[PDB]
């Protein structure tokens, strides 16, 4: 009920919401301008789809939490609980799976160039996000005042659902990204020495940035989520944890900058609109 902590966390949520919204909007606008002026490369399709999924994450995840923590209670009907919980989990899945789809596309384009000649992955990823978020409806039981507070299904519901979420949205994607990136680097190194009868630096500086940013952004949130749920006698209901339990979408504001800076076409298009 602490008013000062509620004010601080509302400010934090508003800051992250505005940041992610503005970043994704400007990047998507630059992408649209580039696309209407010619042909759009397959990299542009995926970076735009990632930005769209990220904007969905923003709107459908940060805003409901923002309003709920502002009111300090939920005044809506019970079904709205299930729908909101569902609509703020789907984005959490979609952002990570867009990243994975982009990396898989790059790996396919480099390590198997003729296989493309012998939009499915993005639609498959959106579908997996919607299907994976379904257990949320059963978990959020009837409000007994605030929205679905103290909600659960079974004694292991608060010890296994959390860890399964942690695995499926934190461990598998980073391992897949690392594997695909090292395979790309190995194929470039193997093909570089023979010559016809440089890019290694960019590949390495891309892999390092991507992996460390992903892990650093996802680490504290899931760490505290595990401590709070896996560990009984949760250590803090105090001021430190209140901020950390609510920064799940931290990397939602960092990956569009990464994939616009590493790319040159999108970076040039955005810098062209810097003076406007």
């Amino acid at each position: 009920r602490d008013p000062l902590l509620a004010r601080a966390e509302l400010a934090l949520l508003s800051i992250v919401f505005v940041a992610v919204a503005l970043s994704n909007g400007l990047v998507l606008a630059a992408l649209a301008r580039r696309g209407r002026r010619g042909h759009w490369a397959p990299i542009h399709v995926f970076i735009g789809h990632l930005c769209l999924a990220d904007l969905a994450v923003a709107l459908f995840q940060v805003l409901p939490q923002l309003a709920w923590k502002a009111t300090d209670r939920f005044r809506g009907p019970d079904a709205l609980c299930r729908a909101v919980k569902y609509l703020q989990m789907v984005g959490m899945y979609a952002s990570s799976y867009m990243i994975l789809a982009m990396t898989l596309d790059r790996h396919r384009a480099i390590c198997r160039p003729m296989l493309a000649y012998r939009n499915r992955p993005v639609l498959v990823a959106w579908a997996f996000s919607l299907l994976l978020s379904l257990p949320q409806l059963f978990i959020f039981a009837q409000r007994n005042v605030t929205d679905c507070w103290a909600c659960f299904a079974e004694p292991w519901g608060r010890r296994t659902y959390v860890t399964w979420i942690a695995l499926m949205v934190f461990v598998a994607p980073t391992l897949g990204i690392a594997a695909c990136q090292v395979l790309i680097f190995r194929e470039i190194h193997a093909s570089l020495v023979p010559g016809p009868s440089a890019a290694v630096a960019k590949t390495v500086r891309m892999t390092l940035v991507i992996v460390v940013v992903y892990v650093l952004c996802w680490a504290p949130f899931f760490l505290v989520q595990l401590w709070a749920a896996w560990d009984p006698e949760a250590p803090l209901e105090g001021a430190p944890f209140v901020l950390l339990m609510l920064l799940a979408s931290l990397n939602s504001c960092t990956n569009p900058w990464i994939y616009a800076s590493f790319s040159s076409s999108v970076s040039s298009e955005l810098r062209s609109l810097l003076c406007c």
Partner: peptide, 9 residues
């Protein structure tokens, strides 16, 4: 607090 009851601090 997105998948577990938020500590109401």
């Amino acid at each position: 607090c997105y998948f577990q009851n938020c500590p109401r601090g």
